[model samples]
Target chain A: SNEYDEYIANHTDPVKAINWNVIPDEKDLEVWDRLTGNFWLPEKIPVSNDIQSWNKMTPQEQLATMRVFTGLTLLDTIQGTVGAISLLPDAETMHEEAVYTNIAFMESVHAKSYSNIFMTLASTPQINEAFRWSEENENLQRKAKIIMSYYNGDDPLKKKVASTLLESFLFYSGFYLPMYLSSRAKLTNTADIIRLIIRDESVHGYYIGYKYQQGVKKLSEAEQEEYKAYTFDLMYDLYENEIEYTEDIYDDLGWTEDVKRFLRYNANKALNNLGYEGLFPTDETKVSPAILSSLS
Target chain B: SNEYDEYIANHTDPVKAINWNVIPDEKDLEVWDRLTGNFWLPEKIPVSNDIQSWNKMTPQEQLATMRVFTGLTLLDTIQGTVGAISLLPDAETMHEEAVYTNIAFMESVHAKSYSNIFMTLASTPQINEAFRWSEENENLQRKAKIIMSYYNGDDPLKKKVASTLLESFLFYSGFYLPMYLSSRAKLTNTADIIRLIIRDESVHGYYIGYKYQQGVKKLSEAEQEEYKAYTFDLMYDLYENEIEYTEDIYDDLGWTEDVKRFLRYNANKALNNLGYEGLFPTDETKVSPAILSSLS
Candidate 1:
């Protein structure tokens, strides 16, 4: 508030502290309340209850499901360590930085939930193989590479754009299996946990994307279109890889077509979270009601 | 992990996923269990119960307490955003990265708890002044600067040493009053929340300190001694700053001498956490029983 303090207040300096009552964006407060309100521990959730369901699955179904979770777990790790941590350096307000910290933490919680599921149901060798498969899976690594490229890039808006996509769009391909299995009366407890993650990612994508829009508004009209083009371009490229990834996980189960529709539906929502109209065709966005009705 | 995966397995690359079942340190798993077991939300706590307690205090006592939280909040912010995030990039094991994410999140939870107390007890104007006072206070900024310099530096062991001090050492200067007040049955609800943070910092400090020792063992004997000297030198600098900080907040309330003992007690514990013997005399390390007896 004074000239003497200006040196300490330099925008480029590491942030000193968070003033929570101060509002740069009320959304930081809104999203924070929702994020914490959704607080949960994986241990508290009875993932072990899904053990019988796992034993009933066919070998292929179990393998594919593990692959999907491996993808989910990998993305969660990147988002926690790479996505949220990268966003902290350029935060416009202290509250937003605090918000990113929460996101980073929750992503780790989400990451650990996969391990929670694996530990309860899979033997050690099986769980280790599942993780090895996740890392060696080409499409999984590709999607991570594409998103991480943006995370490590110079532009802050691009980081959120990429982060929102990871939260809302890329995740659904893997998320589909849990919902699909739950619709068939399998893995209900596991789906129950993914349900928590879906709920979190909804808020995470909306908050990060909304922050992206706020930053976008400060640019020129042409520049806005340029970023929009960049966003759409990235989505399309990620979708191409996602389609291949989805098939790799779902092909053995004959659920690939249904999974693709779910992917488009969320891709559109990801756009909406960024304050844009849907990019996917309306027909493609109509996900099956059975999956929608499953988690509830 | 074969020759084909050697390129992917290089320690310097962007990590793909956390394979939780594969841990380099069992402490990582031990800390993770304890960290999530302690999950708490500030909003759920009855910080409002302390409003009457605030009204009963002398303005000087009230202001000093507010200033303590300001310091508390500042260190929590730096530890959450700077200390933990910096540790993530260098994590020797995937579980440790996961552990840092939990620490980062809990630190935010801890930071928000102070605001939870503020929002419940103080006017927005008064709360703003407290946040402003924290950033402008010289000793508060000095300790933050000293610790952040380590966090941002390339030395990983030094970061943990600084972080342990922040957790077990720097925080107690502010922690003393809360424990003191709790013993007297003043603001018991608020003290309840700080009690949770103390438990968490115990785990956090111990884990990071343990990890620091793990790294030190990889160094030559001369190098180990050099780092130990550096660790002690930094502690001396920070303790000097912490004493000044304690007085700035506690002098007017006639509690400066009592608070210093609490600082020395914690400071010695910080040294122990870093795998060294206590530096303070046995006399200085014995914090008054009243404060210790209070929080429970």
Candidate 2:
């Protein structure tokens, strides 16, 4: 009757309030402990110092930075509101549900950080124009549609797949901009916030990815094989779409090739977390020293 | 069509990441600021001092206190995982979704606070039995089901109605014991944590109830009257159920009558938040000065 692995089918069952003493999975509590220690608000990060760095940028480059954040914001908005909550009912344990809520809250903070950065550095009209561009851009909108469909679908495993991809892989294209900009010693304060977001995303991607693997183990062997194939095929589809998405944003900056490698690197890392072998032949050594050293 | 007034439908739309600068409802932004400023973790609260106070209680009194927390934790768990997230898709503005995530996360913290209290003051088996009692107690379980039913129902306004009742009205039955004990100069540290939970619930109850009223304004005149009727009827139903729930918990301590007064007082306040006239004839003057002053 305690169907931790199954989704809620009726409203009659009593939802156990979470007790850390009765943890069905220690991983949930571990992630929660780490995350709670990392509590942050956008207001806590001082972005005002980035004003001189931001002013030195070309108008086109400034607009590009804003647009990249708008794109990332759309993804965080979806994750905080929809994707994380979608996993609540089909949760493997009470602690997992609690962890997801933490993830959801942090996703909102990530979205707020982008707005705070924009508020600190950009003109109001330029910020407005950047958000408008997020809606109209064809490639960006397509990526949103692809992930949104997975979240809207009834398959919880599939939702995790899309979420992990978004958290771990998809945002790196935009993330690279802040890192590269920081490497040139511009927007260094903004880059600090980006680093925090990246760290949270890593935890998020791994948590969901680990939960997805556990859910898969509950299926029949045939079903397991089917999901495995589905993951790679889905990953491939997203990779193709992301290539176009990457080109659309990075091409304008002439950072397309390095961005593509970073995408493959994270995409394969996502697959590995889902308990599958890597799909892309990625060598971390070949990645840019600027981005690599900035992360290290 | 940006249907912020309606619930999500087909999966063709983009979910924008939140931008506080372009807020459609400043209330959402304002609520988020206040909540983020109030970030807390149970570990931060040094509950060690409460063991001496907890030891001074009779065995019956200690068991009653643990049971009260078990009941309160169930409500907080439900709010964190299901109730708050249920409103995410039905939001009236982008920032409301962000605020709901904050509410959800705080609900988790509230639940965690109860556990930390138990861990600080009770033995392992005692804590286990308290949770076991939460599952078997008919009156407590019924209260959970009543509110959870509304969350699972189709109408978003109905969900808000149920949520406000739980946050503001139903909780005070269990909440009464902490303050009553604190007045006796026992478990004052535990009371401190309870006060924090009560504060968060007030903001939660008011925001959702306010949003529910906004939603009703979009309905036809007849529909508005119907929902107003529905709100009072639903409040009466919860009030009747809560009377028995209070009696069950407070009967042994001879605190039933005063607790009943506090419940009626909060029930009416919940109604006021939902834009309805008070249903009960209870006077604020008749409520216990201990509970009222503790809140003030």
Candidate 3:
């Protein structure tokens, strides 16, 4: 009872929480769907990159990617352990972290899974650990890369915005599109793995979404702008690069039309799910071959 | 200096002093080569299943296989942590049951990795907990699995067998495989994660190997055979269903060739490199598939 009491003070929203439905855009809505409980894995149909593309990467790039990925894995493994510990008493922070722990775990697994398949195909190492910035833990990296700012302690308010925004991009861009294509192409194993990862991440995203909503309920006008700015910055910064990265890999691999359609769906859906009430680079945003030329 | 001395004493090969120059087999050799110096991802090239497999089993068969597999994972996670601590000065014996603690860590990680992967792919809430063994702190449930077999060391010979050969095998099976495989796969990020875990197992394995090597030297021929038989019987009984399980997975995953090649490369290496000579199973037929499949 005492443990439950302590846990509830922090974890288990004893208070009825805000739902993900309040978000309007398709991107945000889908993200809400995923975060709340919808499972998705996009790499179903044998996702692979052109082995030759690996040749184009500089050693520095290779090492940097490796290091950043390692950082991602570290955060995940450590955070996953944190999640495991969450089941115990006076362990760490609230259940909120358990969500991040799950996110960390999924991202780490994604980083590992992608690297595993690519390395197998390329028959060479693909990490680039030389970059100094690559070593930052997930918290700092996410803050700097997406939030462009950091905070002390576990500021629930900041965490809410960060959770909602960053997670939206990951779910729609990294997860939904990839898995949808893979599933459509019927790359059963690849699709299955991604799907499972997405399922777990969905729970994590939902947990954060719930907490973020709760935190937002009492936020002042200043906090609202902060949250919005953080969300906008993350979406904008991540949008182009994320799309290019996903599309480029598929193009280099000479993905089928089914996969292509799925990618487009993911791209559009990602933006919609994030509830971006602002203008964004989309299919119309692409000038030449549309998504095709963008890949180049 | 004292710690280093102990590390050396605990880790060094006094048997080499007596002139033992048989190099480990290729499978074991490759493993040792990568594991001892620096860890890396295993090569992930898809292999045919004739050599080894984990995809062919029915769900019931798979669950049977995972019983040992999951148990071993939990054991290794704990042992891996001990190995991690081994990187520290003077961690040995029952000062804290350092080895057991590390095994717990290895098992925990392995459990988490498998469970998370399985859950992510499955996506359905009903199946989420399927892969996870209940986290029981119960002595019979937890400690008994590993301890009852090894701890009642009234027999020094049994202790030697468990503490040395069996211990090394456990590390090789659990932590070493992950570390070696990730590195070989060029999944440097994943490899990095495995390395942190395996570093601990290496020490634990080495300590066990070294301890047992001492026993082999000290024990009479009769005693040696007795120890060998015990290990053989226990392993065979424990893993009889495992080979069947391995075949089933290989059959299903369609990576039998890949799994076989992995085993062939690894087994030879384990035999020679780790300096494992007279452990058990009494012959290759008994040893090869079970240990190798466990790695896969």
Candidate 4:
């Protein structure tokens, strides 16, 4: 009657159920415990600094800020759901599962943090409209489409490995960039809260990146090459979409071009983290020092 | 490219991607927050009390105690895995998903606590043998088969709601009965550690019971009756299995009859929790004073 009787029966095997005392992967256990240690609540983080900061900013700054977060919010919301309910379940071992659960929970907390930002800066209608705008926004929708294709697919290994790449590269480009950029500009609430989000995402990115590296080793060479091609193509698609999306958000601010360079830099870093060659050839590209420093 | 673009596109709708600010279920939110508040670690509980007390136990008492916990360890291990990777993903709302994640994590922690107790009291070979014994045990295998059928089934709503009842009844009967019995017997390490597990399972059982109640409410009257009948049949089957399992665990101790009474009592309580008529007639059956007091 047990469809997964093999899994239930293999109590001590690292394949299904975990034997916590006999850890096969010390690194995974380390990551899981770190996530547990870093547990945080979005509600507990004060966004008071953003309130005053938002009121003092220009209308264009306000629009840019809200639109940027709306995109990030949508991204984190999906990650939280997919990671918790979807990807985390596919884990082969409990340690791996716990790490994913931690990532999922943190993503939910990150999603809440974005809402906290929107709540602090705008009225109910304004916040609602921003979320609505994210859905209707063409380039943002395109980015979601590309990422979700791999994420929402059937292949467990590919799905999880792809998500690691998504969180490591694609998420960093869209979500982390705007927040890091805003934070570096001395937006108090934005800086304080975004810093917390960045810290969480950084650890998540590293953990997933390591998993991606380990996962790739298990694939057939052809499959690895296929994934490599897919990831490169995906990065290119997301990179182009980020340009269009950021252009809309930073049209008056004239930071769209700089954001493009930042995206390439982060995506390349993510690629290397996954033990793949960097997708973008940034040989002659000059990234702004502020973007580099903020990301670091 | 986004297979679920409609879900992402509809941010305000509670159907797919959650809008955290607009929670449709207030009670689910309460459970979710409570679960968050109750996060804990197995290492934090000083098994020092258990370590010395374990050495002083009679051989029969030691064997019975270890066998009981071995059964619980298997149950928690499977529950943690299925709950994390299977059940949590099926939740319709972020609020509900969060509650399942909390339950899943706590289940993992409970599994770890069992391992901790074993590590403190027994040799690695003995502990390994207990886990192996659980795997090869026919009665335990049958119990797992019955429970895993509901967990590993295809129908989403039916599967999840069935799992809710599974947790509320079958899980409560096996997991809680031992803890209640041990607590009453004043086994210091067993009582202290199992008390923590019982407390956690109580919340989980009640939470799942509420979900089961709400889930069944949506079914047509005939469907509800059909489900009730199916559950009664399942309970009866598990009841037989529990009897055989307990007989083996407490063979020399002569506690099987007492354990059976305790199991039926908890099963009835579980039935009552789900708003169903008690399957076992309680009028003529009397629980031992110890189990009754401990349960109360």
lDDT of 3 by residue, A144-191 (tens): 233312121245455444444443333443343334333334333444
The digit string of per-residue lDDT tens for model 4 on B8-120 reads 56543322334566787887778767766666776677776666556666777766666667777777777766654465555656777656666766777777777777777
Q: Per-residue error at A110 for model 2, in Å?
A: 0.8
- Show the lowest summed lDDT stretch of 10 residues, model 3 chain B: B13-22
Error of 4 at A125 (Å): 0.8
lDDT of 4 by residue, A172-229 (tens): 4455445544645546546656667767776776777676667767889898888777
TM-score of chain A of each: 0.93, 0.94, 0.47, 0.86
Measured against the true two-chain complex, the DockQ scores of the candidates, in the order shown, are: 0.41, 0.48, 0.02, 0.27
Output the lDDT of residue B27, model 3.
Answer: 31
DockQ of 1: 0.41
Alpha carbon lDDT of residue B141, candidate 3?
A: 30
Q: Write the residue-wise lDDT of candidate 2 on A1-296 in tens digits.
A: 32111223454566576797888799998999988888887777789998998999977679779989999998898888888888888888988899999999999999989999998898899988888888888777766777777777788998898898888888888898898899999899899999999889999999999999999999998999988988888888778878888887777778889988888888888888888888866564256888878875
Q: Which stretches of candidate 2 lie over 4 Å from their true place?
A: A1-13, B1-15, B282-285
Query: How would you order the candidates by DockQ, starting with the best?
Result: 2, 1, 4, 3
Candidate number that wins on TM-score, 2 or 4:
2
Q: Once superposed on the true structure, which residue ranges of model 3 sit more than 4 Å away at CA?
A: A1-103, A125-155, A170-188, A240-296, B1-296
